């Protein structure tokens, strides 16, 4: 009856999960000849042996990452006997990353993917990887840098990898290499050697690598000025690139040259790169270059271009004007221009991008833009996303609802300096479907005159501002508005009524008023025929309902409401009246993180369509009022993180549709079949983790949990005992509780 892979857990997909279990050896675990995938991430296995994997002879995939880290954390050296991995003749994937080994173990020729990253291997020679002729992917990053230091550098002897006749992917970052290793296999398709000390590159460093698809050589000549992490200052003032370096790479699709101290672009570098789809030139000194270079003239296939964090070569500079060669980038889909810095976004700034047929995404964060003629973005062919967040725009020139993914025309103006919204700032932006103005300082009585041009806007995020919301005409100029986020609206400083506008928003489906400053003149009714989701989290619904009749019907006029979030409202009680006067259409109610101690369960009949009820984080001390009533449609009940010590028999019994019950993080000493009846065997999840279960020998609860074992999350090791003393904090399977 016990889970077959105790103390580990079956993730049905053949994956035996033994991650994070403090194990010091490979578990031996009802046969194991059918397990093909084993994960042992972040245990404490420091020694591997000849017979450790004999019972796992059919493993295909094996992850031993982080068992014995170098330093690392807060010293460790892993020993590995000769035949250890030879036991697994069909092993295809092995991860030995983050382990203190100095030499690569002997390995079965069936291997295809191998990781040796973050180890202490400093030398790769021919003996290192015999005879891995089926190997396709090899990673060995980070064996010699600040987080994992070596004295010297890692050394890849010439031709050492030629025995890997099938190698397609090779990564050797952060290894202090001073040159690209010699005589690499011609089969290579991906080569990453970023963040070493390769200050010079030529056609001599990429010899016969004619099948290269992606090449990453960035971070080899760094400017360490203002670097978040320890950096090694390049000798030269720029990476040395011979102009014919990349010429023979006719299949190059991705090239990365970031953080290379480049000061000039040369058309030569790209002359052979004609399949080039992705190019990263970020963190260089190409400000001036991109204002005038001819380099982009033939980059006709380029889809993605990163120009972010490019600095100025000379203090004397002209206002940003992208080069005319940019007009040739007809395949361009995404352009990243974060962190370049320019005060001014005008009709010439991005002019040469305007006619590009496929340009959908424009990153413009962190540029300190304080003058923006946003109307230019109404003249582009195919824009879907423009990100102007984190700038200094303050007006016209002279979790989140913003999803919105991929499909809608979206602009992000969050984290700017907007104090007042003027309609003129939106001229020519009438196709916009999603807009964010969150985290500005908008202090304004909104009244239907702010957003006139936005006739198509569907999603509006105005969270974290300072809006007056008493005007019933608010947002009346947005006829297609479906989702509106006004969470975290404050009022640091007596007419109309707060939220009166809701009933006039004919298309509104989703509304957030969460965490709002709410004063005495709130509308006593929210009214709508269209709202299906209301988030009223973090307000004072407790004090409001304490007023008596006044707000007794606050949510009732929301006809058709399906989901209501009243979490964090400092509710201590919930009269039947308050429940009966929520809209009868309600399917989901969240009362998470309140102070409810008692809840008459039979009163759920006042909510006939309820399917999901969240009472987590309150202080129900027992499930005992109390029973789920005939004939509730409740499918899921979360009563986790309360202080439930007991449940009345038959509590869940009448809940014919019940599928999920979370009972975790309570103070239960047992879990009892009598609480449920036959309902227990239709449950899809039964969560009983973090309860002080009493692990006595006679303990009835084991039988129940084993019966529904497939349905209890973390059953194998994650369900612990509170008692007795020797089993405190230990798995309920640490001993055999069935023996009595
Ligand atoms: C990398 O090599 C350089 C050579 O100048 C040396 O300063 C450093 O010891 C190496 N880095 C580390 C700490 O691994
Ligand atoms: C692109 O190719 C043309 C010939 O097809 C060549 O004349 C031109 O100079 C190239 N562009 C640049 C600036 O390298
Ligand atoms: C049960 O509730 C707890 C809250 O602490 C959560 O961590 C856990 O993921 C929940 N289980 C399910 C099935 O969501």
UniProtKB/Swiss-Prot annotation:
Glycans are attached at residues 34, 95, 113, 166, 176, 208, 266, 275, 298, 306, 428, 447, 498, 600, 625, 630, 662, 682. It is a single-pass type I membrane protein. Activated by proteolytic cleavage of the flexible loop between repeats LRR14 and LRR15 within the ectodomain. Cleavage requires UNC93B1. Proteolytically processed by first removing the majority of the ectodomain by either asparagine endopeptidase (AEP) or a cathepsin followed by a trimming event that is solely cathepsin mediated and required for optimal receptor signaling. Palmitoylated by ZDHHC3 in the Golgi regulates TLR9 trafficking from the Golgi to endosomes. Depalmitoylation by PPT1 controls the release of TLR9 from UNC93B1 in endosomes. Changing residue 20 to A: Significantly decreased NF-kappa-B activation. It is found in: Endoplasmic reticulum membrane; Endosome; Lysosome; Cytoplasmic vesicle, Phagosome. Disruption phenotype: Reduced proliferation of lymphocytes, reduced interferon-gamma production by splenocytes and reduced neutrophil numbers following Helicobacter infection. Induction: Following Helicobacter infection, down-regulated in C57BL/6 mice and up-regulated in BALB/C mice. Changing residue 74 to A: Significantly decreased NF-kappa-B activation. This is Toll-like receptor 9. The gene is Tlr9. The chain holds residues 28 to 810 of 1032 of the full protein.
């Amino acid at each position: 009856t016990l889970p077959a892979f105790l103390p580990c857990e079956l993730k049905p997909h053949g994956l035996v999960d033994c991650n994070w279990l403090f194990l010091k050896s490979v578990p031996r675990f009802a046969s194991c000849s059918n397990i093909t995938r084993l994960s042992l991430i972040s245990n404490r296995i420091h020694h591997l042996h000849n017979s450790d994997f004999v019972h796992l002879s059919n493993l295909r995939q094996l992850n031993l990452k982080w068992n014995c880290p170098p330093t690392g954390l807060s010293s460790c050296h892993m020993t590995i006997e000769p035949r250890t991995f030879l036991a697994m003749r069909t092993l295809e994937e092995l991860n030995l990353s983050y382990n203190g080994i100095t030499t690569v173990p002997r390995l079965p020729s069936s291997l295809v993917n191998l990781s040796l990253s973050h180890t202490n291997i400093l030398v790769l020679d021919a003996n290192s990887l015999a005879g891995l002729y089926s190997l396709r992917v090899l990673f060995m990053d980070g064996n010699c840098y600040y987080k994992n230091p070596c004295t010297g550098a890692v050394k890849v002897t010439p031709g050492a990898l030629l025995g890997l006749s099938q190698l397609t992917h090779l990564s050797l970052k952060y290894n202090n290499l001073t040159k690209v290793p010699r005589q690499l296999p011609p089969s290579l398709e991906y080569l990453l050697v970023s963040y070493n000390l390769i200050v010079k590159l030529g056609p001599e460093d990429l010899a016969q690598l004619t099948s290269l698809r992606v090449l990453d050589v960035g971070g080899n000549c760094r400017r360490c000025d203002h670097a978040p992490n320890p950096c090694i200052e390049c000798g030269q003032k720029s990476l040395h690139l011979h102009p014919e370096t990349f010429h023979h790479l006719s299949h190059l699709e991705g090239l990365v040259l970031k953080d290379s101290s480049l000061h000039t672009l040369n058309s030569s570098w790209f002359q052979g790169l004609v399949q080039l789809s992705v190019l990263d030139l970020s963190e260089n000194f190409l400000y001036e270059s991109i204002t005038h270079t001819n380099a982009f003239q033939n980059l006709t296939r380029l889809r993605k271009l990163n120009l972010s964090f490019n600095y100025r070569k000379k203090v004397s500079f002209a206002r940003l004007h992208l080069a005319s060669s940019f007009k040739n980038l007809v395949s361009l889909q995404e352009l990243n221009m974060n962190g370049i810095f320019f005060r001014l976004l005008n009709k010439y700034t991005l002019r040469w991008l305007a006619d590009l047929p496929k340009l959908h995404t424009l990153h413009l964060q962190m540029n300190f833009i304080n003058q923006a003629q946003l109307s230019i973005f109404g003249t582009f062919r195919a824009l879907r996303f423009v990100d102007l967040s984190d700038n200094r725009i303050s007006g016209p020139s002279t979790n989140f609802m913003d999803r919105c993914k991929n499909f809608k025309f979206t602009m992000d103006l969050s984290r700017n300096n907007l104090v007042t919204i003027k309609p003129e700032m939106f001229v020519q932006l009438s196709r916009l479907q999603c807009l964010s103005l969150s985290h500005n300082s908008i202090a304004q009585a909104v009244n239907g005159s702010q957003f006139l041009p936005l006739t198509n806007l569907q999603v509006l995020d105005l969270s974290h501002n300072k809006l007056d919301l008493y005007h019933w005409k608010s947002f009346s100029e947005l006829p297609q508005l479906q989702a509106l986020d006004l969470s975290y609206n404050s009022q640091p400083f007596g007419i109309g009524h707060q939220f009166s506008f809701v009933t006039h928003l004919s298309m509104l489906q989703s509304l957030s008023l969460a965490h709002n400053d709410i004063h005495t003149r709130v509308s006593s009714h929210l009214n709508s025929n269209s709202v299906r989701f209301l988030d009223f989290s973090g307000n004072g619904m407790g004090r409001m309902w304490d007023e008596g009749g006044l707000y007794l019907h606050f949510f009732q006029g929301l006809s058709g409401l399906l989901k209501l979030d009243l979490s964090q409202n400092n509710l201590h009680i919930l009269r039947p009246q308050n429940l009966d006067n929520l809209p009868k259409s309600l399917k989901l109610l969240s009362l998470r993180d309140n102070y409810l101690s008692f809840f008459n369960w039979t009163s759920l009949s006042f909510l006939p369509n309820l399917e999901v009820l969240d009472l987590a984080g309150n202080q129900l001390k027992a499930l005992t009022q109390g029973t789920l009533p005939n004939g509730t449609l409740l499918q899921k009940l979360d009563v986790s993180s309360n202080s439930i010590v007991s449940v009345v028999p038959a509590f869940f019994a009448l809940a014919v549709e019940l599928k999920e019950v979370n009972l975790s993080h309570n103070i239960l000493k047992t879990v009892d079949r009598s609480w449920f009846g036959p309902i227990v065997m239709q449950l899809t999840v039964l969560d009983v983790r973090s309860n002080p279960l009493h692990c006595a020998c006679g303990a009835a609860f084991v039988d129940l949990l084993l019966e529904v074992q497939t349905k209890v999350p973390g059953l194998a090791n994650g369900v612990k005992c509170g008692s007795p003393g020797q089993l405190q904090g230990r798995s309920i399977f640490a001993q055999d509780l069935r023996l009595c």
